Amino acid sequence: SHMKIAILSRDGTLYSCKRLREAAIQRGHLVEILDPLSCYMNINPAASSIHYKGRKLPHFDAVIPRIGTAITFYGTAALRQFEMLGSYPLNESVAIARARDKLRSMQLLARQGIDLPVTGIAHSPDDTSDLIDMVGGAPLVVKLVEGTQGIGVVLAETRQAAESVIDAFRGLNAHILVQEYIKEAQGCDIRCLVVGDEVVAAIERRAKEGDFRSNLHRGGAASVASITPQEREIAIKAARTMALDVAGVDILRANRGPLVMEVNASPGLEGIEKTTGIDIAGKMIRWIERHATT
Amino acid sequence: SHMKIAILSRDGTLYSCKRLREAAIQRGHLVEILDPLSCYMNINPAASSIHYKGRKLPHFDAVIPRIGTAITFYGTAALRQFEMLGSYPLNESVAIARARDKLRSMQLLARQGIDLPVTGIAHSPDDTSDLIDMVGGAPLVVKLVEGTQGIGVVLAETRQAAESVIDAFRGLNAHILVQEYIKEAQGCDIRCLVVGDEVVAAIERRAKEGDFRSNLHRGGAASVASITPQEREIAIKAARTMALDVAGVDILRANRGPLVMEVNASPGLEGIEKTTGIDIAGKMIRWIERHATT
Amino acid sequence: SHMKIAILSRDGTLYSCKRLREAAIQRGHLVEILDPLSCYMNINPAASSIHYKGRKLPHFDAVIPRIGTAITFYGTAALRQFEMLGSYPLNESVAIARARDKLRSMQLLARQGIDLPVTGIAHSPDDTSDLIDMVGGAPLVVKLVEGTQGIGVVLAETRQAAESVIDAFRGLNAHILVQEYIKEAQGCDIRCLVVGDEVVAAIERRAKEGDFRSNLHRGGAASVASITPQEREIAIKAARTMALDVAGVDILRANRGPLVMEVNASPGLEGIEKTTGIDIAGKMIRWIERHATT
Amino acid sequence: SHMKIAILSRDGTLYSCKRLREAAIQRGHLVEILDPLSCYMNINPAASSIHYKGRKLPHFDAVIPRIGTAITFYGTAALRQFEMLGSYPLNESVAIARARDKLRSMQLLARQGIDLPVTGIAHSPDDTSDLIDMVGGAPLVVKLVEGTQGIGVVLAETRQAAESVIDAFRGLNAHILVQEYIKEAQGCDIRCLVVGDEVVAAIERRAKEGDFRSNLHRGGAASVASITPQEREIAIKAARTMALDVAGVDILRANRGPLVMEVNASPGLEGIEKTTGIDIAGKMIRWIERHATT
Ligand SMILES: Nc1ncnc2c1ncn2[C@@H]1O[C@H](COP(=O)(O)OP(=O)(O)O)[C@@H](O)[C@H]1O
Ligand SMILES: Nc1ncnc2c1ncn2[C@@H]1O[C@H](COP(=O)(O)OP(=O)(O)O)[C@@H](O)[C@H]1O
Ligand SMILES: Nc1ncnc2c1ncn2[C@@H]1O[C@H](COP(=O)(O)OP(=O)(O)O)[C@@H](O)[C@H]1O
Ligand SMILES: Nc1ncnc2c1ncn2[C@@H]1O[C@H](COP(=O)(O)OP(=O)(O)O)[C@@H](O)[C@H]1O
Ligand SMILES: N[C@@H](CCC(=O)O)C(=O)O
Ligand SMILES: N[C@@H](CCC(=O)O)C(=O)O
Ligand SMILES: N[C@@H](CCC(=O)O)C(=O)O
Ligand SMILES: N[C@@H](CCC(=O)O)C(=O)O
Structure with a gap:
């Protein structure tokens, strides 16, 4: 196979190491990790190379966007250029953009029949x-x-x-x-991580004593999860509805049933990987392998 | 015909008066002018009424969004709800949203073959x-x-x-x-105003002596314009590409030819109406009449 | 007398007209109204002229700062330059600066024995x-x-x-x-306006039915006020403590007694002038006359 | 001696460790490191205890403010409360506040005769x-x-x-x-660190090849410095003028002579301590010992 894969992110964190790792290991792909903010390019004469630190980037078979919530306008622009150059993205620009808008996304999920x-x-x-x-x-x-x-x-x-x-x-x-x-619940939500058409890993996030929250660490404690087939179906449908290739779906267990609370296009890996022992970064590279043309 | 038409804007300016005016006059439509910011609604149980000052809005056959550049996330959300309720919009939410992003829009225009x-x-x-x-x-x-x-x-x-x-x-x-x-040019750009599939009005905006600009009033002086058939075609294609029903296209006359500099989904009417004497607000209501289902 | 008086403000509102008015009328002073933001100057070679629209300002006997709450860092800098050039200010830079900080000001008032x-x-x-x-x-x-x-x-x-x-x-x-x-009160606070060592005018500001507030117009209705000698003393002490020459003191009538709620170094004139018929702008020019050296 | 010393800062960095260190070591003082943002208190009934995580703070003989440039309004408020409670501060609130304003500070230095x-x-x-x-x-x-x-x-x-x-x-x-x-210079400025009435340490900060700067690390390289007696006098006068007990003065070597470029009330210690080997944190505690009343 041997693909050149770019990763769009602003720095080196576990997620960034774990896929430089999994891509160099798995079918011997090359990996460059690029700051989107450091990319510069002619959006005019349609396509045109992307520049980075004075040089032209060499054409990636695929791009893994992992753009920050505060840099999403420029991030997706750079993403869009890679796409126009032929790179496959896990999570495409439009999908990423729309997903950042929680309002638009909640609306869309509701229209498509998903219980919130x-x-x-x-x-x-x-x-x-x-x-x-x-x-x-x-x-x-x-x-x-x-x-x-x-x-x-x-x-x-x-x-x-x-x-x-x-x-x-x-x-x-x-x-x-x-x-x-x-x-009801009790500061406990389930976080499922979808890659393509399957839930790949899932944890329970548990609140602390002081009021509720449950956030990753607003006092959060993770533990491995037992997802019902119904919850599994839902979290996959949510990602499909959002047109996300990789997504973090958060689910609350209500009496009436499981409810989607949020969908993320750049879920963190560390907490959920360490909690479950699942090789998530690898399932992502694998997905790229099944879908990127070389 | 007799439609109920809502206008999404934050206040009463010439544009807002000129269509309350043209809608009450033309085929005797009713008009309510709503602050998008004052709308509130359940984005869940899909559709659901929109609330405004303690009461439920009564169902509009059409909505005229004229959302400000700083309120575009919530504005388009409210817009989206009207759309989900059956109201026809001149300029739909997606189109409006995308258009606010000059980067995405410049990219798109370039991809579709439009000279920038x-x-x-x-x-x-x-x-x-x-x-x-x-x-x-x-x-x-x-x-x-x-x-x-x-x-x-x-x-x-x-x-x-x-x-x-x-x-x-x-x-x-x-x-x-x-x-x-x-x-070359000389602080002079042409602003065409597209409604549906025609350029409806067009002015020359002229800079002042101190450097350039040309902006509406960064020192700007308007005068009526003589658009070439080519410029006319372009400004219509630009709006089509952006999927905008109403748009302001700005064009620069280069030696090589006319170049699109910008596309606006909420063009101001006053300068261009007063300069040309054209009833633009009326062409907009007329467009609604040809496209909204009652 | 005949003074040249500068007024530091960003635009022409009632307050700005009412003192161009009262200064040209009263002892025939000349008045220039300057945007602080448009001033530019060498803070180095100590003193040095202030520039405004390409020309050097001609030396003012006095400056009336009326700087906005969002421009207070640069505003006071320009103010400081006028002071260094010899202009008398009603309200000096330090006092104005400190007063903008409600925390520092509340602390100071409390230390000096004023009931809050x-x-x-x-x-x-x-x-x-x-x-x-x-x-x-x-x-x-x-x-x-x-x-x-x-x-x-x-x-x-x-x-x-x-x-x-x-x-x-x-x-x-x-x-x-x-x-x-x-x-207790009831959405009613008393606003006293201090010029120098006297309360010059005072109104009651009254809330609307919906919750409380009382703000100028958060639903506010003004009416002329009957200040107790005690309230009068307090509002004068507050301004003295803050080292403000002109100030708006707001007072709440509690069972235990009158309490200072806020002190403003740039009180609006319109509401209080129209409500009482008092020539406040004139008392301000008069104060300048008693204190500025020509 | 044995003082209780509070340190106002938002986290644990070298500076914060190096004085917990030097205060526990030197005359056996106790040290608590407090987030100013976590302090809460009644600014009314004048003085009144400061609360921190649900408990009342126990009275500090001295406070070492090291407040961030983005938290300076609240920071100085908390500082002010400590001062009102009797704690000696190295760098007092007013001085710190004023110093953050580069405009006011440049003005003041210029008025007092210091070459900029x-x-x-x-x-x-x-x-x-x-x-x-x-x-x-x-x-x-x-x-x-x-x-x-x-x-x-x-x-x-x-x-x-x-x-x-x-x-x-x-x-x-x-x-x-x-x-x-x-x-002239060449991206090289001298940073002197003043504690009380002496320059305690001083380094040369040197730019990189790409344009200039010289900033700590905008490409900066430190090396030990040979200050002239004149430069020494100036950097001490600057701090005196600003009424700062601890300050970082930056000096540029011009043909005409040494020029003060900036004065900081919270200079970083790491670069300058490691470069020179001087125990700066200790000279600070020592200064407190000479000036705080127990
Ligand atoms: N509607 C709700 N009902 C109960 N708990 C909630 C609700 N919304 C949020 N929470 C809790 O508060 C935490 C913060 O939620 P939020 O910040 O919206 O999502 P995320 O955890 O993805 O950042 C969640 O983990 C959840 O456990
Ligand atoms: N690339 C360019 N070449 C020449 N003139 C330009 C260019 N871009 C902008 N201008 C001038 O500066 C003015 C400001 O442009 P801009 O703010 O981008 O668009 P708008 O006028 O729609 O706000 C324009 O009216 C135009 O005349
Ligand atoms: N502590 C309080 N008790 C009762 N009423 C208050 C209090 N603080 C504010 N209010 C009311 O709310 C209004 C808003 O107050 P604020 O915005 O702080 O002052 P200002 O009216 O000077 O802007 C005031 O006019 C006052 O009547
Ligand atoms: N007027 C000037 N002349 C020459 N060099 C300068 C001048 N101002 C700043 N520099 C260089 O640029 C760097 C950045 O300066 P600045 O950010 O103002 O101060 P600081 O270094 O304290 O952050 C300085 O270290 C200095 O070497
Ligand atoms: N929220 C919208 C979808 C938004 C979009 O398609 O961009 C809906 O109800 O379908
Ligand atoms: N700029 C993109 C289009 C963006 C979009 O479709 O939302 C392109 O080249 O087609
Ligand atoms: N609030 C301070 C005064 C602040 C100042 O003097 O600038 C005090 O208690 O005196
Ligand atoms: N910059 C002022 C001093 C400012 C102050 O004292 O707060 C001066 O020229 O003295």
Whole structure:
């Protein structure tokens, strides 16, 4: 096979080492790790080489984007150029772009029939009481966002709390914001990692005693997971709907059933690899091998 | 006919008055002008009504988005909900979203065969000299952007100027940036306004004595325009490529021929309407009449 | 007398007209209104002229700073240069600078013996429950700030509300934040305007039905005020403590007595002038006349 | 002696270790290292304890502020509270605050007779040519700032370069900006470190081949320095003028003589300690011992 594979990222972290590793090992591929920010190119005379530190890049059979949440406009532009040059991407630019927008993505998942928690959208709602009654929740989660980021989640246990919180963020200097109801669960969500058409690995993320969260480390403790066939199907459908080749789907276990809470196009590998012992980076290179033309 | 038409904008300016005007006059349509930021809704149980100041909106046959460049994530979300409810939009969410990204849009136009000025893309280029030689320019225009905004253009007449400018912005706190070569022209660009499959109006925008620009009012003076059939074709193709129903295409007259410099999905009406006397707002309502189902 | 007076502000609003007016009328002074942002100067060879639109400014006997809350670093720099050139300022740079910092100012007022509401300071407090118990409040006001701005106030009626709010802002992307207890009062605060050593005018600002606020227009309705001699003394002491020549002091009427809530170095004139009929702009020019050397 | 010493900083870096080290070793002082952001307190009932992670801090004989450039408003507030509680600070709040403002500080140094390079100040100058002629430079350095930060320096070798650069930043989204002329020197500046009334250590910082800079590591290489008695006097006067107990003064060797380029209230220790072998952290604790009351 022997492919030249580029990896779009800003630095060297476990994920970056684990695939330089798995690509050099597996069918003896060459790997260059490029900062997207350091790429520069003529978007005009259509295609045209990509430049990096004064030299022309040599044509990659494939590109592995792993673009940061704060560099996603330029990142996807550079990604787009690689695509136009013939490189196969796991996760294509459009898909990556759209996925960063949690609003667009939640909308899309909902339209395609995927069970989410009931969720409200707002920015400067003008009648908070009506917004709270919509969504139904008396206890619910409010998630501040600002553009396409996320700068906070918070639980509002009472009506008044939910009121004061929304009224706080309403001062648009916090910008777009999301309401959805809290769970049974217990600060425990399941993170499935999809590569192509299968769930490749899956862990339970568990909260700490102080309120909830559950985030990777907002106090989070990982443990290996027992996914139901139903959860497995869902997490694969979610990625398919988002047109993501690699994705992290987070699932909450509600009484009514499993609910998708979020979908990531650049899931971290370390926690989930170390927890399960699964060679995820390898399943990714393997996927490239099945799909990239050389 | 009698349609209910919503207009998505944050305030009442000429454009907003001129179509409340033209819609109430023309086939007696009703019009509500809504702040997108004041809309709130359940993106979950797919579709679901849109709320505004404590009440449910009553279903619009059509929506005219005119979303601001700084509110485009939430704006398009609200737009998307109207679309999911059955409202026809002139300019659809996806198209609007993509168009805000000048990088993606320049790329797309270039791929589809549309003559642009030669243009470079960069963020933190690491070898400015190579970047300047690429693009070729010895005098060229550098356009700072930051996300999806634009916070400056500047002419660099010499190599050294172009160097110091790029090196200035390279400190990423300016983020993404665009290089392209300057013109003959003379601070004069042509702005065509496309509605559907025709150019509906067109003006010459003329710079002032102090350097160049030409911007609406960076010193700009408008006058009525004599578009060549070729320019006309191009400006229509550009909008088609971008999948925009209404668009402002800006064209520079180079020796080699007309070049598209920019495409806007929310062109201002005042300057161009007053300059030409053309009823543009009416051609927009008319377009809705030909395409919205009631 | 005949002074040349400069006014540092970014535009022409009532305040700006009302003193061009009162200075040309009163002892026939000349007035130039300058954008601080348009001033440029050598901070080196100590003193040195200030340049404005290509020319050297002609030496002002006095400067009236009215610098915006978002331009206060450069504004005060330009102010400082005028001071170094010999111009008398009503409100000096240091005083203006310090006053913009509500934290430093609240601290200072408290140290000097001036009754404030009980007030807590926090940024990323780590134990919200302890923070709420400190301050004592079960209902209290949380005021988000971010640098030196203010981007929100909110009432938290219960413990849980106060919790969810603080936890929301704790995500430092909101930065510094202030807790203090709510009042009897009733959305009514008294705004006194101090010029030199007297309160020159004073209005009642009254909230609307929807929650509280009281802000100028967050729904605010003004009416003429009956200040107690005690309130009068306090508002004069506050300005003295802050070393402000002109200041807006806001006072809340608590059971225990009058409490200073805020001190502004650039109070607006329109609402308070129109409400009372007092010639405030004139008392300001008069103050300059008593203190500037010609 | 035996003092309790608090160190205000956000994390554990060499500087933070080297004084936990030197304070526990030297006259057996106790040391707590506190995040300023985690402090919370009643700025009202004047003084009042400082809270940290749910508990009351136990009263420090001294505080060593080492506050970050992006947290300086809240940092100095917390600092101020310690001061009000009786703790001696090396570097007091006012001094630290003022020092962060490079504009105010450059002004002050200039007024007090300290030779700087000739320096211009601007934000949106309206006539760049006049600004460049002022300052005199044909080659000069332009330093972008934005509030109180610094987000770039750049050399402009020609008039045109200097023009395009200033015109670029003029789009206020870059905000305040500084012009001063370039040097002989050669990317080499001298950094002196003042503790109290002496220069305690001093290094040469040397640029790399690619343009200039010289910054700690913008390519910087350190080497031990031979300060003239004159340079020594100056660096001590600068700190005295700024009322800083500990400061980093940077000096450029011009033909006309040594020029102060910058003064820092929180100089890094690592580069300069390792380069010279001097126990700087110890001279700081020693200074506290000579000045703090127990
Ligand atoms: N609607 C909800 N109900 C219950 N728990 C939630 C809800 N939303 C978020 N959480 C918890 O808070 C944590 C933070 O969620 P979020 O930041 O939205 O996703 P992620 O964990 O992917 O960053 C999650 O891991 C989850 O356990
Ligand atoms: N590559 C170029 N060559 C010559 N002139 C240009 C170039 N780019 C921009 N200009 C001039 O500068 C003005 C500012 O352009 P820009 O801000 O990119 O577009 P818009 O005018 O749509 O805001 C334009 O009207 C144009 O006349
Ligand atoms: N601690 C408090 N108790 C009661 N009412 C308050 C309190 N703080 C603020 N308010 C009300 O909210 C309004 C907003 O206050 P703020 O924005 O801090 O001051 P300003 O009115 O000077 O902008 C005030 O006019 C006041 O009436
Ligand atoms: N006016 C000047 N002339 C020559 N060299 C300069 C000038 N200003 C800055 N430099 C060089 O550029 C580097 C960056 O300077 P700056 O960022 O202002 O200070 P610091 O090095 O303290 O961060 C300096 O170390 C200095 O060597
Ligand atoms: N959220 C949209 C999809 C957005 C998109 O296709 O880009 C939907 O309901 O289908
Ligand atoms: N710029 C891309 C198109 C982007 C898109 O389709 O969203 C191209 O070359 O086709
Ligand atoms: N807040 C400080 C005063 C701040 C200052 O003097 O700048 C005090 O308690 O005195
Ligand atoms: N730069 C001012 C000093 C500023 C201050 O004292 O705070 C001067 O020329 O003295």
